[PDB]
Design a protein around this ligand. Structure first.
Ligand SMILES: CC(C)CCCCCCC[C@@H](C)CCC[C@@H](C)CCO[C@H](CO)COCC[C@@H](C)CCC[C@H](C)CCC[C@@H](C)CCCC(C)C
Ligand SMILES: CC(C)CCCCCCC[C@@H](C)CCC[C@@H](C)CCO[C@H](CO)COCC[C@@H](C)CCC[C@H](C)CCC[C@@H](C)CCCC(C)C
Ligand SMILES: CC(C)CCCCCCC[C@@H](C)CCC[C@@H](C)CCO[C@H](CO)COCC[C@@H](C)CCC[C@H](C)CCC[C@@H](C)CCCC(C)C
Ligand SMILES: CC(C)CCCCCCC[C@@H](C)CCC[C@@H](C)CCO[C@H](CO)COCC[C@@H](C)CCC[C@H](C)CCC[C@@H](C)CCCC(C)C
Ligand SMILES: CC(C)CCCCCCC[C@@H](C)CCC[C@@H](C)CCO[C@H](CO)COCC[C@@H](C)CCC[C@H](C)CCC[C@@H](C)CCCC(C)C
Ligand SMILES: CC(C)CCCCCCC[C@@H](C)CCC[C@@H](C)CCO[C@H](CO)COCC[C@@H](C)CCC[C@H](C)CCC[C@@H](C)CCCC(C)C
Ligand SMILES: CC(C)CCCCCCC[C@@H](C)CCC[C@@H](C)CCO[C@H](CO)COCC[C@@H](C)CCC[C@H](C)CCC[C@@H](C)CCCC(C)C
Ligand SMILES: CC(C)CCCCCCC[C@@H](C)CCC[C@@H](C)CCO[C@H](CO)COCC[C@@H](C)CCC[C@H](C)CCC[C@@H](C)CCCC(C)C
Ligand SMILES: CC(C)CCCCCCC[C@@H](C)CCC[C@@H](C)CCO[C@H](CO)COCC[C@@H](C)CCC[C@H](C)CCC[C@@H](C)CCCC(C)C
Ligand SMILES: CC(C)CCCCCCC[C@@H](C)CCC[C@@H](C)CCO[C@H](CO)COCC[C@@H](C)CCC[C@H](C)CCC[C@@H](C)CCCC(C)C
Ligand SMILES: CC(C)CCCCCCC[C@@H](C)CCC[C@@H](C)CCO[C@H](CO)COCC[C@@H](C)CCC[C@H](C)CCC[C@@H](C)CCCC(C)C
Ligand SMILES: CC(C)CCCCCCCCCCCC[C@H](C)CCCCCCCC(C)C
Ligand SMILES: CC(C)CCCCCCCCCCCC[C@H](C)CCCCCCCC(C)C
Ligand SMILES: CC(C)CCCCCCCCCCCC[C@H](C)CCCCCCCC(C)C
Ligand SMILES: *C/C=C(C)/C=C/C=C(C)/C=C/C1=C(C)CCCC1(C)C
Ligand SMILES: *C/C=C(C)/C=C/C=C(C)/C=C/C1=C(C)CCCC1(C)C
Ligand SMILES: *C/C=C(C)/C=C/C=C(C)/C=C/C1=C(C)CCCC1(C)C
Lengths: 222, 222, 222
């Protein structure tokens, strides 16, 4: 459309759609209950992202936020996506290593706090306070990354695949607060069309790339 | 009130209230943990619907959506209801057959996608796009119905009761996308007062009728 | 600020922040899975409350509701807090006594209904109807309190600690509907600044006070 970022929302929509259908077909036939869990979780993630990319593409998931005395285009639908998809991604990791339930609840809840405070930050009209929310969200993120690294006799296959996905997760997720900070939600140093591209690349990598690694491994089978 | 559909919202409120109190009294005394689960799930469903029917009745759960250059009355509270009640209904089925957790997560998540995209569709102001959301929601519904039919040594009692509730579920749930399509959210072929009646009959049947079948069966006891 | 209630939102923010960091440090080193659960649940509760107290403090979690022909300041962020923190508090109790899953689902769902109907009540513009929602919410609360008292061979340590926390819970939670009723959401007999103080004292007691009791007990360890 007239939104220069449309192309990246259209490509992200397509790529998440295609990944969803690929993982859907792929899990057909799986009967191993353990594998079934990883397929469900991992197919749902880009399915949800598909819908929220489409909602941005069609303009539904966009709102205007006044701050710095301008009308700032804020794509709120990203936060509806991440609210569900990031705990699911963490559940994939958590099930892989057979985490304690207390650790899973710590992780999902810290994640909720991460996304929810990112959303408040995204919609806050007092510019300096936006970054207070950014910082609290970032602290939740660092708690999560901490736990993925220092809170965890897995069969070697589990350990191997977990170590790869953990490294994928730390590197990609750590980029999100930077993109937000430099983009239109934060300091406005990078234009929205380039921010939207950055988040498209991260999201497809963190969802479809991550799931391709995971669903290809024997680590998911009993 | 001045809303011709008020009578059907009032009757639905009453019928969901009465079913809630009936199942509440009925489960008094149940000590079998397995039965306790089916009572909790099944009592909660019309309790939630009661509150959302009342919110429509009092006017809180109604908003105006501009599309086709008119101010279209959209009852959004139905989606808050269904967001919680339809996965609970699926959990009842899922527990009955002792489904794998991966299958339960596939089902709840597809359901979330179904209702959430129905909600986006209901609130979308570009008329043609409303039906894009309808179609995606319908595809999620067909996934769910698929799984209820082709994804599942139950004691005979389980199998019998499941087969009945599964048939109830496919027939009633499949009617919802049609009512939406022909009613005020979609093509506007049927007036809101008749749509509201249709959804009242479906909802009471899918909640109170379904639970009467289920809670009467010995299938719910260990 | 210019909001006389700011001091109590600032103190509540600080006290919930400090309790969160205290329980965080405290649970460092716990390896007992059972204890890990109670720490996660119990650290998350004031963490969430911290964010929602800060959102009120900064003005984000405040909206104006027209009712009685005035513009009534309503802090909606309390309901986002409680929506998550009150079922977590109930989960702490429920895990302590090893409740049946059916009882946990009854409790979380009644709780959802309690907070959600409180929220509708808080945002309803027809003044008399506000108290219809109050009453339904209160009925959900009384169901919960009922179950905490009459629905439950625990090791003596469990029983002791549960009896204390149950008594803490009944007394503090029962005060919330009264504060709402007499305060700015309800009859307007007590000013918002005094209401905000009352809820600050209850919240800190029900979260940080409750968790101090719980996390100090050996009841949380296998
Ligand atoms: C858990 C565990 C931990 C809890 C986390 C603690 C922090 C909780 C914060 C949350 C608060 C939510 C804020 C939001 C609902 C308030 C909306 O008001 C906006 C600000 O004026 C108005 O913007 C105008 C438009 C805005 C758009 C917001 C919409 C978003 C919706 C995403 C939700 C998704 C759920 C799918 C539902 C179907
Ligand atoms: C920070 C604590 C440790 C965490 C506690 C939460 C507090 C967050 C506050 C950090 C800091 C004040 C933010 C203040 C930004 C300030 C320079 C705004 C500039 O002033 C201009 C006119 O007043 C704003 O117009 C517009 C000018 C803009 C283009 C300037 C953008 C501001 C940027 C802020 C960057 C935050 C990162 C430095 C934090 C990295 C650590
Ligand atoms: C570090 C830790 C918390 C930092 C406390 C600081 C205290 C700030 O005092 C005043 C500075 O003028 C803020 O009030 C000035 C008026 C405004 C009020 C702002 C106070 C809040 C923005 C700070 C609330 C605590 C912060 C939490 C930082 C997040 C943490 C998780 C990294
Ligand atoms: C976004 C990209 C980085 C852009 C730059 C492209 C260069 C790629 C560098 C990423 C890094 C790759 C990490 C490799 C890993 C392999 C190590 O595994 C170890 C074996 O046990 C795990 O131990 C311990 C594990 C340790 C591994 C921690 C990974 C680091 C995380 C980096 C933070 C992020 C980057 C911040 C984004 C930046 C763009 C602002
Ligand atoms: C899971 C697993 C899968 C996730 C599903 C993927 C699709 C996610 C989509 C969701 C997005 C939610 C949209 C909505 C929050 C945005 C509201 O903005 C509207 C559109 O301009 C404004 O309408 C004005 C009024 C509107 C009314 C909307 C209110 C509704 C609230 C229902 C929520 C309930 C929760 C009970 C809370 C107490
Ligand atoms: C369809 C794909 C397979 C799924 C992918 C999602 C795309 C959904 C698009 C389907 C289709 C275009 C919808 C277009 C409706 C079109 C006739 C609108 C009529 O034009 C009028 C003026 O432009 C609209 O005013 C008002 C006129 C209205 C009274 C007309 C109502 C439109 C109706 C659409 C009915 C949809 C069902 C046919 C789909 C059953 C399959
Ligand atoms: C809404 C009503 C239908 C309105 C019409 C009233 C006539 C009633 C027909 C409903 C049908 C009844 C199904 C009976 C079932 C019994 C079969 O059980 C089988 C034994 O294993 C299950 O195998 C395989 C099971 C097979 C059963 C699948 C059921 C079919 C589902 C029909 C879709 C819905 C109807 C679409 C709504 C329409 C009004 C637009
Ligand atoms: C379960 C089990 C049981 C389900 C309970 C049954 C009752 C369900 C009722 C729910 C309905 C939610 C109502 C609300 C979303 C509608 C908002 O419209 C308001 C009224 O005109 C507009 O106020 C303008 C502003 C308002 C502010 C409302 C925001 C609040 C957000 C809190 C949600 C939190 C989730 C954190 C998300 C990030
Ligand atoms: C009650 C049933 C058992 C439960 C079913 C739900 C129905 C709730 C209705 C209870 C009752 C009507 C509420 C009616 C309040 C009425 C006195 C309002 C006073 O009239 C004034 C002008 O019309 C309102 O202006 C403003 C005047 C205000 C300052 C008056 C505040 C009203 C107060 C209502 C108090 C409710 C508690 C008594 C309920 C305790 C039990
Ligand atoms: C006691 C039980 C339910 C009470 C039913 C009463 C019936 C009220 O009849 C009319 C009185 O004029 C209300 O319609 C007058 C127009 C308005 C409609 C209001 C009707 C609803 C406010 C009542 C819906 C049922 C109530 C539920 C009370 C909550 C219960 C859980 C304690
Ligand atoms: C908010 C405060 C009360 C303000 C007044 C300060 C005085 C403190 C009184 C609170 C009470 C203390 C309860 C002690 C308990 C100890 C009993 O344990 C028993 C041993 O099995 C449990 O059996 C059976 C357990 C029984 C215990 C039930 C507790 C009662 C609950 C009271 C309802 C609340 C108060 C309503 C608030 C008011 C301020 C409107
Ligand atoms: C059969 C497998 C390999 C997957 C094909 C399904 C299609 C959709 C997603 C697949 C590609 C993603 C690889 C993961 C990592 C990346 C960093 C993706 C970032 C996107 C950038 C654009 C590059 C081209 C693509 C169209 C694949
Ligand atoms: C004791 C049992 C039978 C239930 C009585 C509790 C009352 C409320 C619901 C009970 C009736 C519902 C039967 C399920 C199926 C139906 C298709 C219901 C659709 C509603 C249509 C109106 C018919 C009359 C009613 C008032 C029951
Ligand atoms: C190490 C322990 C004791 C806790 C210290 C962490 C700090 C924050 C919360 C601790 C205090 C709360 C006690 C629970 C009960 C109360 C009724 C709290 C209500 C608050 C009223 C203000 C009183 C002073 C306070 C600043 C503690
Ligand atoms: C599917 C997409 C994923 C994996 C997205 C991850 C998003 C985050 C890790 C976001 C983090 C943020 C912060 C740490 C700071 C505030 C802004 C956020 C929400 C972008
Ligand atoms: C308690 C009520 C129940 C069982 C409601 C079920 C609702 C659905 C199956 C709704 C389905 C829809 C679609 C498939 C298409 C878009 C519109 C919906 C949300 C009405
Ligand atoms: C962390 C805070 C807690 C424990 C808050 C508890 C809140 C309640 C028990 C609220 C109850 C309410 C009703 C029973 C009636 C309507 C108003 C409410 C939501 C304040």
């Amino acid at each position: 459309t007239g939104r220069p970022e449309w192309i990246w929302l259209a490509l992200g929509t397509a790529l998440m759609g295609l990944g969803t259908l690929y993982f859907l077909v792929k899990g057909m036939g799986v009967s191993d209950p353990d594998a079934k869990k990883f397929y469900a979780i991992t197919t749902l993630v880009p399915a949800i992202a598909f819908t929220m990319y489409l909602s941005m593409l069609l303009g539904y998931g966009l709102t205007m936020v006044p701050f710095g005395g301008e009308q700032n285009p804020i794509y709120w639908a990203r936060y509806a996506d991440w609210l569900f998809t990031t705990p699911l991604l963490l559940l994939d990791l958590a099930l892989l290593v057979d985490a304690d339930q207390g650790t899973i609840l710590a992780l999902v809840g810290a994640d909720g706090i991460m996304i929810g405070t990112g959303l408040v930050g995204a919609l806050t009209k007092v510019y300096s306070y936006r970054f207070v929310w950014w910082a609290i969200s970032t602290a939740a993120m660092l708690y999560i990354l901490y736990v993925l690294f220092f809170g965890f006799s897995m069969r070697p296959e589990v350990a191997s695949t977990f170590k790869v996905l953990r490294n994928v997760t730390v590197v990609l997720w750590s980029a999100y607060p930077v993109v937000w900070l430099i983009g239109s939600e934060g300091a406005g140093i990078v234009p929205l069309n380039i921010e939207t591209l950055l988040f498209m690349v991260l999201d497809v990598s963190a969802k479809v790339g991550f799931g391709l690694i995971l669903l290809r491994s024997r680590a998911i089978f009993g």
